Amino acid sequence: REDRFLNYFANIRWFGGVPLISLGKKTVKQPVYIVDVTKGIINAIKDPDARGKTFAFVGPSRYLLFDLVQYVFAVAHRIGRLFEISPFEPWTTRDKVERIHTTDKILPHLPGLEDLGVEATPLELKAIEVLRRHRTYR
Amino acid sequence: EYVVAKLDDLINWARRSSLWPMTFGLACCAVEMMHMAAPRYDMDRFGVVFRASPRQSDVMIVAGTLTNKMAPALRKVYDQMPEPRYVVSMGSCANGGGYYHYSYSVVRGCDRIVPVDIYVPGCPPTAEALLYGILQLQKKIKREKRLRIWYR
Amino acid sequence: WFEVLPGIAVMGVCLFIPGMATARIHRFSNGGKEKRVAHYPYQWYLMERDRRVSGVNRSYVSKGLENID
Amino acid sequence: NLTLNFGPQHPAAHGVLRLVMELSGEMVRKCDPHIGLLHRGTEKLIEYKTYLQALPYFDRLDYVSMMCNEQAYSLAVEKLLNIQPPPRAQWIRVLFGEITRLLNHIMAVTTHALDIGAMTPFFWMFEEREKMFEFYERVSGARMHAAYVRPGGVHQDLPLGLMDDIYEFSKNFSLRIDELEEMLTNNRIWRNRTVDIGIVTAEDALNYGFSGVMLRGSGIQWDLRKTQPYDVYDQVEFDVPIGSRGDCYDRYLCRVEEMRQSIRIISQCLNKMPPGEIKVDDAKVSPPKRAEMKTSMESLIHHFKLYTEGYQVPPGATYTAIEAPKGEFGVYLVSDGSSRPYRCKIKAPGFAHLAGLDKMSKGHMLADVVAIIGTQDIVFGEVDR
């Protein structure tokens, strides 16, 4: 609901909506859903025998496309900061812009999520919830 | 800094100088608050104005007894409040639901729904310990906004 | 009954300023003289004339009998 | 048609009673309100308690009456137990039973005059109301909710005082009711705000099962206050008001004359009280005194057992009702034969007095509807019957 990476998109009401960076090469990474994250911990908290055997979190099916950025504006139809405003909680034109566009689908020999089951969530069903813009009905 | 931390002795003073409360009259604890509005223990003009629209509130007050037919309607009004809010519930039936406590259709606590900060006990708290609870609340505001972004 | 009297002496004093201020501007801008008003076009014609012959460029100064003797 | 639910709105009055309005443009012609905001599980809850232990849950049934409730309970129990209460005790139940009517009939006008929107008669009368809660604290136990009337008559005697206080109180009250006469009666706008509104006068005004005012002040002379006795209550002299037509303004003018009766009765009751005892003497129902439950042997066994269990009530159904200051008060107390009662079904006003809002409302405005409600004097938590 209230992460930074998916809310980095659609908070870009601007004089230009550019992807990163006008290219559909590496997009995207593996957006695992947040219920699967909290479900992996509670199974492992008395698993047993899960010490040292580090685990990896599978995402959805399967890699992902450039369509995601077009998927934002299609369906959206185009906490202790301060008393007034924080002076610097920016979009950070620095190494922030590259920490997500470096996908690295890593080694599948980690067990790491389906064995710490059961976590299976698509993207197309949970996308209605988090996105919220001016139409709200159609 | 001595310069910056001097400022929140105005702002965290100003919010504890003008509170615009909502009251939810549901049961017999509503009637005693009206006598606090009656000018013996005159509730107005000790920092705090009378009733107000549901939009412009800071301190909501749940009084009386909650039923399961009111548990949705409480949360929706609780969402519409702005951010520096506080919940203070009077009445012994807002702290565990008094007795009626073992009944099939009474919200157990008025704490498993909203997060509440100050608990006044009693079938009717006699509009004598309740101004004492409000001066407890302004005493609770010793918080800071500077040295929060100035620390982290 | 007493406490309302400091309430009266705040907002009522807050209206004392602009009537005092404006009457200490146009009196000050014309040097202790009131401002020449003009409601009819014949009335303006005096100020349109007399500014050109006052001494240099002013409408709030006079010449008097001793000008042309 | 627009289907607005002007109710849950915390627009003063009593932020509750959420209903529907199928208004025909401007007129309403269809009103179907919803109740049940406080159901509380009352009538199921009493089925596990005893008689003395269940008693304050009658007290918290109104917001206002503290001695008119529990008057409808002990008198609903003493008939089952073949007891008349002692004579000093009956003069107090009429005194506080004719002092709670000087709490409803103050609240029934001011709170009606606040929905309407007048500010100053709300503060001009509750500041005089404070002179009366000092009585409640001085006699029983608390601010309002007092477990004071018992089945064995009065709990304890009122202390030294309270006779040059009530006479001090009641000799300076008719000036305060002469204030609101200047505030509302001779005024035109409030008269224009309520004339010919809620004209319900036919025999369906009684087929709907209404109790008093929104009765006799609309017509049919009948009341439970001198055709049915309670205690020493017929030995005092008074009259009952009747208004002219069947609207709200001729059920409003009951309540001005009604408060002009309770002053007479208090000034008649004080002259007639004899000295005597408090409780019923046979002590199978009343507890014995504190100076007795520390000396003899017979006192403790009829003390220690009388709180583990309650009384011994004979079986056989019963029913009664008295004059609540807004209506009848039905209690159909089913007895079984032990310390714990069986079913205890209550009838409160508002079942009749608000189901007949359907007949009363239509043909009229929307701003009429809020002005209707504060005339019947409907209090929620009391519609939990």
Add this chain to the structure above:
Amino acid sequence: MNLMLALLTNFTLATLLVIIAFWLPQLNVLPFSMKFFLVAITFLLFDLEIALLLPLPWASQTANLNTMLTMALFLIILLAVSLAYEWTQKGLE
């Protein structure tokens, strides 16, 4: 020449304050009813015939007066006869 430099301060002051109000110190990162129509039409009728009634105080420092007397009273007549036929039907108004 300040009229026009007289209100320009007033309107730039209102649009300034909203930016400190709605903007930067926030940063969160019909059914038709006939009876509610005919009064607007009725108002505009009596809104016109007060503008013809409007030039009166300049119409007194004038020539022979009984022309200006008997005719100015006639507009009030037409403003009043218009009431009476409309007074036959106002509706729930």
Add this chain to the structure above:
Amino acid sequence: TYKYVNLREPSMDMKSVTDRAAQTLLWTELIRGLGMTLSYLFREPATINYPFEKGPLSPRFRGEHALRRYPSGEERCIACKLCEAVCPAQAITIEAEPRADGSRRTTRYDIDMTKCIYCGFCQEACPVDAIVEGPNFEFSTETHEELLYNKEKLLNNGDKWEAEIAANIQADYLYR
């Protein structure tokens, strides 16, 4: 009996209409009446300055719980359980045990100050007059986890004061 209020036919003659015509037209009503009954402002405001001033009470006023004891400390409670069986909210819970001296005392002692509905019957049920509703409204902590009073609040709370308590019982025990 009867009374017919608001039942009076009008006058309807030449002169008395002028009292009803001057009423509507020039408003001799609504100002002589309602502009004078408001003012009426010169009376003294009867307001209590609560942190400084306080209001009246009664000697039989209820409030905070406390426990008493004899002269030099004895635990006046005898754990005869009667206050438990008449509590309407069952806020009492007592586990007793023979203490090694021989006389029975308490181990756990609870008052659910949340659930406590203040029927005060505990004050009128103890034979050895142990529990007393102490007249102090000092309250309002910040958690639900705190108001459940254990025993070592109550003996301490019964010993923050006693002369407050011991004078009210001694002025009221003759009535009850």
Add this chain to the structure above:
Amino acid sequence: MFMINILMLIIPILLAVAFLTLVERKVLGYMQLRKGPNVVGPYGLLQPIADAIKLFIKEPLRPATSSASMFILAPIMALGLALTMWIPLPMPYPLINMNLGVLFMLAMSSLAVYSILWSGWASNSKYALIGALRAVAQTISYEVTLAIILLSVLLMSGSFTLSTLITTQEQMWLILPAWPLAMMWFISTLAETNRAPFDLTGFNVEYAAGPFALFFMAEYANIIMMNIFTAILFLGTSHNPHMPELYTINFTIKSLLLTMSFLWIRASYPRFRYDQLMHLLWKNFLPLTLALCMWHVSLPILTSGIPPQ
């Protein structure tokens, strides 16, 4: 230094009503047997300065169901014309000597109804869509009851400008020939500015802490303005050329008493139940207005007392 006359009229008039919500309650206080602000002042006088800080701290959440270009547009004009109407007003010297200004006050006040139609409409449904309409529908009925009886005293005073209005009332207190008009002046002006007897007045409930304060600050700006406008018209004061200070002493102090009247009538009366509220204008007010409109024409003619201009 024309600019410093501007800032020494706009700014010193904001504190004239920012310190009135205090006075609103204390006058309300000492009727109900209760005191003013007690803990903060000490005499109250430190209360509104802190409360003014709060409404710009508290977060103004915006409706997602509305536009933004229309929603802040109504507070733009709210301080615009409701402060512009102060400008050609004498004390004893106006900022602008307008040749005609009584029409100019009505020309600006007629756009006050053009603001309420914005905020209810562009926001939301029902309440904000139907409930905000009726309030225009009452306040369109109080220009014809306003402007006609306004015109009936210009027939006797003489002209349109306001500077001649002082000289023509130097002996009179002109309520004495127009005490029937004095009611229908003050009743109608009370009704337009949306106050306690004439109230039905969703066009506020959607505004959070930011822009509610404007349409609480602009509405109050109107009410002392209808006081100061009745002040120069009915209860005219004396004028001294050599002593201009003595004018303003007995000028605002007379308007300050009539300022209390809106606070004083509010503490007496109920509402009017909308169907009556327009019914008491057309059926009841308006036929007397035409009659007295005919009255002030024939009588200066049948006096040979025409006012010169």
